[PDB]
Write a protein that binds this ligand. Sequence first.
Ligand code: MG
Ligand code: MG
Ligand code: MG
Lengths: 170, 137, 178, 206, 244, 30
Amino acid sequence: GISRDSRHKRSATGAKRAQFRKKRKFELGRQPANTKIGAKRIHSVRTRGGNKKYRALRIETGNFSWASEGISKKTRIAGVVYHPSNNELVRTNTLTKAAIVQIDATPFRQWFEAHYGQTRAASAKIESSVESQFSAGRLYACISSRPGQSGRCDGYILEGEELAFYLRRL
Amino acid sequence: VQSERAFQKQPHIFNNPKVKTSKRTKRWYKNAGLGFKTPKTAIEGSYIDKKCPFTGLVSIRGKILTGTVVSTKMHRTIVIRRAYLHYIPKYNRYEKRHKNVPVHVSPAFRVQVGDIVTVGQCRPISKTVRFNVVKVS
Amino acid sequence: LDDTLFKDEITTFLTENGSQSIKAEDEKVVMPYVLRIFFGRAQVPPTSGQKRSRKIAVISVLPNFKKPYINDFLSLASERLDYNYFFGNSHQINSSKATLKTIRRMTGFVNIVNSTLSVLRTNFPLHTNSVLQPLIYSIAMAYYVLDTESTEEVHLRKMASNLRQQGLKCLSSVFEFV
Amino acid sequence: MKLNISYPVNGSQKTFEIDDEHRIRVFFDKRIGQEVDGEAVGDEFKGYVFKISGGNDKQGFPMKQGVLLPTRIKLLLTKGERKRKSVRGAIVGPDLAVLALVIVKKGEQELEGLTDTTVPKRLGPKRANNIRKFFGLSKEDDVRDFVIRREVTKGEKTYTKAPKIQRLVTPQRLQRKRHQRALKVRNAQAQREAAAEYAQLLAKRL
Amino acid sequence: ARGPKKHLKRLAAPHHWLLDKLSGCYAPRPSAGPHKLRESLPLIVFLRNRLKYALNGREVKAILMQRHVKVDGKVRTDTTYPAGFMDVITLDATNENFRLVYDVKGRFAVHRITDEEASYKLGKVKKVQLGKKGVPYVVTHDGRTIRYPDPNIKVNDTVKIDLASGKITDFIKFDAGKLVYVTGGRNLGRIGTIVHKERHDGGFDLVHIKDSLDNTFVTRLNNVFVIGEQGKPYISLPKGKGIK
Amino acid sequence: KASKGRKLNYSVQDPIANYEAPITSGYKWS
RNA sequence: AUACAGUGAAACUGCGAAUGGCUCAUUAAAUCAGUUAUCGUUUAUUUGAUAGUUACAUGGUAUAACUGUGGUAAUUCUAGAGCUAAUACAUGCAAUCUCGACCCUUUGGAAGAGAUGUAUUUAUUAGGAUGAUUCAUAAUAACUUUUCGAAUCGCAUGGCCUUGUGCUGGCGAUGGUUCAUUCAAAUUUCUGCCCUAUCAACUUUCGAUGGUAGGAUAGUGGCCUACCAUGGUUUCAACGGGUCGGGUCCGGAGAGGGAGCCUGAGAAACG
Ligand SMILES: [Mg+2]
Ligand SMILES: [Mg+2]
Ligand SMILES: [Mg+2]
């Protein structure tokens, strides 16, 4: 039923074009994948060609990357906090790309103690806000993957002016 | 710059806060070719534009056209006017015709209603925008 | 034990402060079961992209345990290796212990320690009997095999060279971290 | 009602027509997969146990497992494609024409056509490991001698037929494996030599 | 059509095949292969309507299934295999070797060659790029992907491929004064020397070609195939030497 | 603004006209 | 032919059925004709390259055809029993290359030090080709309900000896990862002869024009959605009214009504 054909729209002049032809299979769309936090739950989608797309209907874990330190760890996703496109995705805790989520900081905390031996010092120094978040127990991260296409919720921890701007918006 | 709900950044360009080597935020740019000079204001500017041919994820290829600006009342897009003479054989006569072409204009350019612009074709930016301003004069 | 749900169980069941995490009272009884189970998974040969990931995941859950349990896991790895006779005597290797089988067990032990050093780094708990003594005994074994054995035992010599190369790598690391 | 009783150990099966409604009554209210005692059915079945497995109604429609009704319903049947077709319920009732039973256990007396008679398996094992399992052969034993052979006679002619062993280890298969391994080795070596020559060409050019 | 076509009407077949208009209602549709549909000669047409060695399609099928016909040193059994420009066709039983070259008229010519001249072919380097594991390779006009080329080789150069091993024996750079064959446009089949190569960025490059009679004509770069330096072509030419 | 239906439009809609009929009896209580 | 071996119905697997054929109701840049791009995409097959990272070969977690018992008024309607296989379905296994002391021998051996899949997702780093790239390619850390890396077949029985059917093997077939190529498909740039003002406003009245972000797409894209800007065409005629295309071929559709799905590389399928 969903279609991407541009024939139905009005012409640039504003004329109402007539229905040229029936809907074709090569111009289809599929229903959105409202990823919500919960037990992992994905089903494959057989797309054009032999390719396959994974639909992340539900997901609770993701690989998140600390870019400044250039490390990546698998962490649980606590909950959505702020989403730029629409707010009501925040209310229902829906996951999509560019959504800001709160992730458990425990693996990063353990790794940091392992690598730096601190709860040498100048390198260990990190932004004040990130240390405050570590104290809190949850880290603000931005999802970089597209859960409705690849079935993953990979992303990275907010840092610097990213963190400043999003904290202001919060 | 950051006048939107979502943050604006050049994708996959990373600025390492820990190293803090440079005061200036790292900026990525390319030269569009066809002898079209990339302006400096793009190089050391601070705007973010995904559809800028010099800083965005767009490539200029295909026909290159010229026209006169007729409207600039939009955010980062304009309407130019291309005139020509259409020949009717039956009345063996020319008639003045014009077509209005919408075009994306990068913020690295400053354009007024009336100046001449050379534009290059690009992948469909919007419903009607298929071109991108590449030289103002 | 199930392969498909192995990973997601780790991030839920064993994650520190996790909602499903084991209770402090139940740590004593349950944890011995957990260590044995992971030890079986850690011996999977890393022949593919997925198999490598599972091995890393098994080693990556260790920091979540408490330090006494980490030592317990290391002790299990060294239990098969017989090193008490070596240090008990004046640092003399037994020819009977010198076999291809014994080297294979040593290589399995050293590989676990090398991986565990990478994840824990400065926090790695080092103990004589648990780690350092078996680690030392392994490097001594590689030297003895390398010199004593003839060129005919090309495989055994090759394996001995690998153990020494890994053994010295391990010692260089443990000093650097702890 | 007619009862189609099957003894699976034999592979035998026979039909018994029923007239009195009282054994039919003890069969009433039961369900597919349940068990009934033959002694209630009749003295001939004394000591037996029947598991109900299927059957057909007076209109010929079959019963289906998993549905709890005493009547017919149009259910969406499958094996990809699915068809809405009528099926009887799984509850035994007076609407059933023929009821199929499997003898789980044998009673005191022996049924004439079921417990006394056998029907041999139509075909024997074909895969080698199946032959070994069927005859319990050791690994050292070679299955080739123990394969089942059936004699076929045409008039005065007579000759033996035996199946083709699959999954058998034969010199051809070892040769194929050896050839595959050698082929991989040769391709790798040729590619390394090509890379070396390319490096030499670059070295000469520089 | 709702998918790939499989039938080719006779009148819609390429003109240069010279198929009888009254024979039937369909023509051989060249199967997928090294050469384009419109720029190829399927083996059925070459064996039947050019050499006349077969009287009908069935006889061509028998000829091929005997494994007598080799296309570029490899046996082919598909009747509609798309043989093309600089293709070597060998018939061992008849002691015949052929190389497909456009005559001045612009149609494929039956050009008999010696075995030594059949041991190699020429390929225009259509593309040069690095493959997986950082191994450079060249794609020629006939679809061959040759790895570890000479670094000097660039696009529009022409390489000399030995068929037995499928390796580059030598190469010719694209430059002024080189001998060139016209493989498309109105001047197809003519031979000349490069004089000057006009360059238009973002558009089709044009080149000027002068023939031995000193007449000059311009052609797009895509339709030029370098065959050697002036007066010393690396292959045998058809009768007339592509003049007029 | 009115685009995408964000502004309420009260003009009659033929497809949903007379989609259902009222009950004349009214609510159970008087 | 003492496993089978010639031929071979049936059945399971594999491929194909989107080609071909037929009629013209529709629609006046909608298709279409010429022309251009894909640095914006998918592509069965063909052709050319390309994967050293219990095993003298695993299971039924398996059934058809087939044997046999029946129900029904009855069908390409049926259920109960009993077998048996794979290129079906599952599972699965003592090497090479660098720096090279000894400069021992001066090709050379060589102590020791090292290095060693692919596929998906994200983050980060370096970066031969084109005018131009965040391109090609390489590396690091992790991720996967995640792949793939011959448990396959025909013909023949050569070379070695350590006589064991010991070791080592010739030509083909069918598979399979990625890239290129071909067959295609999808969008897309510019231009393109009717009468009209007695058709002067139209679009924005469930997007109209544009930006940011997401969802979907094989992908670009108001294609759809959230927020925000107020716009776009037109007296050089927008909007509206009237009247199959190009040249037997090439295009364009459609085959109880309407809605919803399904496989496949390709269909909104004449299934
Ligand atoms: Mg009746
Ligand atoms: Mg098919
Ligand atoms: Mg977008």
